[PDB]
Amino acid sequence: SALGKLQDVVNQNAQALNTLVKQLSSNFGAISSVLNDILSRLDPPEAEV
Amino acid sequence: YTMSLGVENSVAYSNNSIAIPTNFTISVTTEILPVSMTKTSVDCTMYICG
Amino acid sequence: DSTECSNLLLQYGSFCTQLNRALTGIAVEQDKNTQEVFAQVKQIYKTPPIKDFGGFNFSQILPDPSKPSKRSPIEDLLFNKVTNGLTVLPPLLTDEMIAQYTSALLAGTITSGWTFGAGPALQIPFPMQMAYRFNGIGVTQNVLYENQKLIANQFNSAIGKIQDSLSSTP
Amino acid sequence: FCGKGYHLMSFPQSAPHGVVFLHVTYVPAQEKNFTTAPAICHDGKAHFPREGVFVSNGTHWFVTQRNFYEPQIITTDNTFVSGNCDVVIGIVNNTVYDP
Amino acid sequence: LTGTGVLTESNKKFLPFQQFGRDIADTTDAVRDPQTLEILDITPCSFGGV
Numbered sequence: 001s002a003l004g005k006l007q008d009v010v011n012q013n014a015q016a017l018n019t020l021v022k023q024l025s026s027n028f029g030a031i032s033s034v035l036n037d038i039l040s041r042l043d044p045p046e047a048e049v
Numbered sequence: 050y051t052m053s054l055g056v057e058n059s060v061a062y063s064n065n066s067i068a069i070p071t072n073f074t075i076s077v078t079t080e081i082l083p084v085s086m087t088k089t090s091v092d093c094t095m096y097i098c099g
Numbered sequence: 100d101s102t103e104c105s106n107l108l109l110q111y112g113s114f115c116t117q118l119n120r121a122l123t124g125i126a127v128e129q130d131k132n133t134q135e136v137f138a139q140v141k142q143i144y145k146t147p148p149i150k151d152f153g154g155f156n157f158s159q160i161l162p163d164p165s166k167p168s169k170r171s172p173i174e175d176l177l178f179n180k181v182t183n184g185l186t187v188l189p190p191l192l193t194d195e196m197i198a199q200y201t202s203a204l205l206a207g208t209i210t211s212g213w214t215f216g217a218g219p220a221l222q223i224p225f226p227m228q229m230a231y232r233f234n235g236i237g238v239t240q241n242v243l244y245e246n247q248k249l250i251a252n253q254f255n256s257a258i259g260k261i262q263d264s265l266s267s268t269p
Numbered sequence: 270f271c272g273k274g275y276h277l278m279s280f281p282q283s284a285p286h287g288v289v290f291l292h293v294t295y296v297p298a299q300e301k302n303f304t305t306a307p308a309i310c311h312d313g314k315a316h317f318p319r320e321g322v323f324v325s326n327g328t329h330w331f332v333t334q335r336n337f338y339e340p341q342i343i344t345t346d347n348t349f350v351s352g353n354c355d356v357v358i359g360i361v362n363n364t365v366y367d368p
Numbered sequence: 369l370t371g372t373g374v375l376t377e378s379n380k381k382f383l384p385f386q387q388f389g390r391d392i393a394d395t396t397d398a399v400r401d402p403q404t405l406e407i408l409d410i411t412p413c414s415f416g417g418v
């Protein structure tokens with residue numbers, strides 16, 4: 001634990017990056033979290049929503 | 050437990066007593082200081098849209 | 100307690116985890132700040148029973164044994180003059196512990212000068228410590244020793260005026 | 270600012286996303302009690318230490334540098350005169366050698 | 369399932385019921401193609417900043 005400050009910097013940066021990447025798997029109230037599915041499933045007036 | 054702040058010490062103060070070091074210790078201590086992070090960039094358009 | 104609201108909130112991902120993580124980081128950083136300010140010495144020093152410091156008077160800054168919190172008069176004045184899912188976390192160091200740390204720092208700097216900050220605490224008479232500090236600003240020792248009572252009187256008067264100024268200015 | 274103790278020098282070491290400083294410090298050790306005085310009274314003159322501090326090992330009075338015990342004969346070379354003995358509180362009587 | 373990338377031979381030992389692979393971001397990483405049952409490694413073609 002001597003190098004804890006640098007390891008903390010690395011862990012916070014990597015963890016923030018991982019959380020940002022994981023946020024792409026949330027649909028945020030939409031039908032799906034994948035844009036390709038929404039494009040290939042719906043008409044444009046609802047696809048825009 | 051209730052943590053201890055440190056080991057108690059009573060300095061033998063008087064108005065005519067001085068403590069003079071007869072020796073010394075050459076001590077080396079480390080100080081770790083973060084300097085930079087990883088330089089990341091995000092393609093906002095392709096992140097949101099692909 | 101709404102179950103449908105929570106069911107909808109799971110669709111938003113780990114926003115709650117981010118906010119709790121950031122607040123936890125702030126909370127531990129506050130304790131780290133207090134440690135770095137106050138916990139600078141691992142020896143708890145105490146002032147001698149006899150307060151013979153060559154005429155210098157530290158009663159306003161030394162702890163008061165009469166008080167239950169063992170705070171100094173100036174510290175007690177400072178503490179008197181400063182007044183849905185949310186929780187307030189108590190600080191790691193209590194006010195009593197911070198007062199003990201401050202008391203240890205005061206006892207070290209009164210009985211040992213700057214020596215306790217660089218190693219073992221080395222006892223030295225306070226007029227001689229203040230003569231060293233006079234050397235540190237380019238003033239010879241004799242200027243202090245020949246005016247020792249006057250310097251002690253000025254120091255005591257200035258400390259008293261600090262207490263009065265704190266008490267009277269909101 | 271550069272480690273615990275009286276700073277001597279520091280060495281930088283490169284580290285991943287940071288820097289490590291090796292702070293070399295002078296930490297005093299093996300302290301010994303002495304009897305001290307603010308000044309030495311000699312022939313109605315007050316002698317003060319030029320660089321050090323007056324210490325007594327029990328029988329003799331010496332002048333030593335403040336951060337290391339190194340007693341020396343109290344002479345007119347390592348002391349300066351200011352006033353008489355009637356003003357300094359705690360002055361003690363001792364002879365001041367003259368080369 | 370729609371996506372864009374390169375289709376290559378894969379050395380990931382899939383289980384027989386397993387049909388497609390997963391990463392952190394949920395964009396498809398590998399698949400088992402129909403009509404052949406062959407497992408294809410999916411990597412999106414190169415991007416970067418200019």
Ligand SMILES: *[C@@H]1O[C@H](CO)[C@@H](O[C@@H]2O[C@H](CO)[C@@H](O)[C@H](O)[C@H]2NC(C)=O)[C@H](O)[C@H]1NC(C)=O
Pocket residue numbers: 059060061062068300301302
């Ligand atoms: C200088 O002398 C004083 C006493 O005249 C020493 O102080 C004592 O130290 C011991 C050991 O730590 C304690 O048990 C006593 O309670 C202390 N007495 C007082 C009155 O404080 C001091 O340790 C001596 N210093 C050196 C460097 O020898």
Ligand SMILES: *[C@@H]1O[C@H](CO)[C@@H](O[C@@H]2O[C@H](CO)[C@@H](O)[C@H](O)[C@H]2NC(C)=O)[C@H](O)[C@H]1NC(C)=O
Pocket residue numbers: 071072073074299
């Ligand atoms: C000052 O302290 C040093 C160590 O901090 C002493 O050196 C030690 O001396 C003993 C006896 O001579 C040896 O057994 C050790 O091996 C030495 N240690 C080192 C690191 O060299 C030194 O003697 C002390 N000097 C005085 C005058 O007390």
Ligand SMILES: *[C@@H]1O[C@H](CO)[C@@H](O[C@@H]2O[C@H](CO)[C@@H](O)[C@H](O)[C@H]2NC(C)=O)[C@H](O)[C@H]1NC(C)=O
Pocket residue numbers: 150156157158259
């Ligand atoms: C140090 O200062 C304190 C306060 O500045 C002195 O305490 C005063 O003592 C006189 C008589 O003993 C009282 O009339 C005052 O009311 C005290 N002041 C307070 C604020 O309580 C103290 O005498 C001084 N000297 C020493 C040696 O402690």
Ligand SMILES: *[C@@H]1O[C@H](CO)[C@@H](O[C@@H]2O[C@H](CO)[C@@H](O)[C@H](O)[C@H]2NC(C)=O)[C@H](O)[C@H]1NC(C)=O
Pocket residue numbers: 326327328329
């Ligand atoms: C204080 O220091 C002085 C000087 O080091 C000591 O005086 C010497 O003591 C030795 C003891 O055998 C004698 O041989 C020398 O002749 C003395 N020197 C002089 C100039 O007289 C003295 O003994 C020390 N006192 C204590 C209590 O340690």
Ligand SMILES: *[C@@H]1O[C@H](CO)[C@@H](O[C@@H]2O[C@H](CO)[C@@H](O)[C@H](O)[C@H]2NC(C)=O)[C@H](O)[C@H]1NC(C)=O
Pocket residue numbers: 310361362
């Ligand atoms: C230091 O020496 C001076 C001068 O030798 C001493 O002062 C004398 O003290 C005696 C005792 O009271 C008086 O009778 C003399 O009149 C004083 N002479 C002068 C010139 O003041 C002084 O007492 C000595 N101090 C110590 C602590 O021994």
Ligand SMILES: *[C@@H]1O[C@H](CO)[C@@H](O)[C@H](O)[C@H]1NC(C)=O
Pocket residue numbers: 064065151306358359360
């Ligand atoms: C220290 O105080 C005592 C009284 O407690 C006094 O007799 C002595 O002269 C003082 N010494 C110095 C150097 O002030």
Ligand SMILES: *[C@@H]1O[C@H](CO)[C@@H](O)[C@H](O)[C@H]1NC(C)=O
Pocket residue numbers: 402403404
């Ligand atoms: C046709 O596809 C089926 C899967 O539906 C597979 O079992 C079969 O082997 C395929 N036949 C050929 C000739 O590719």
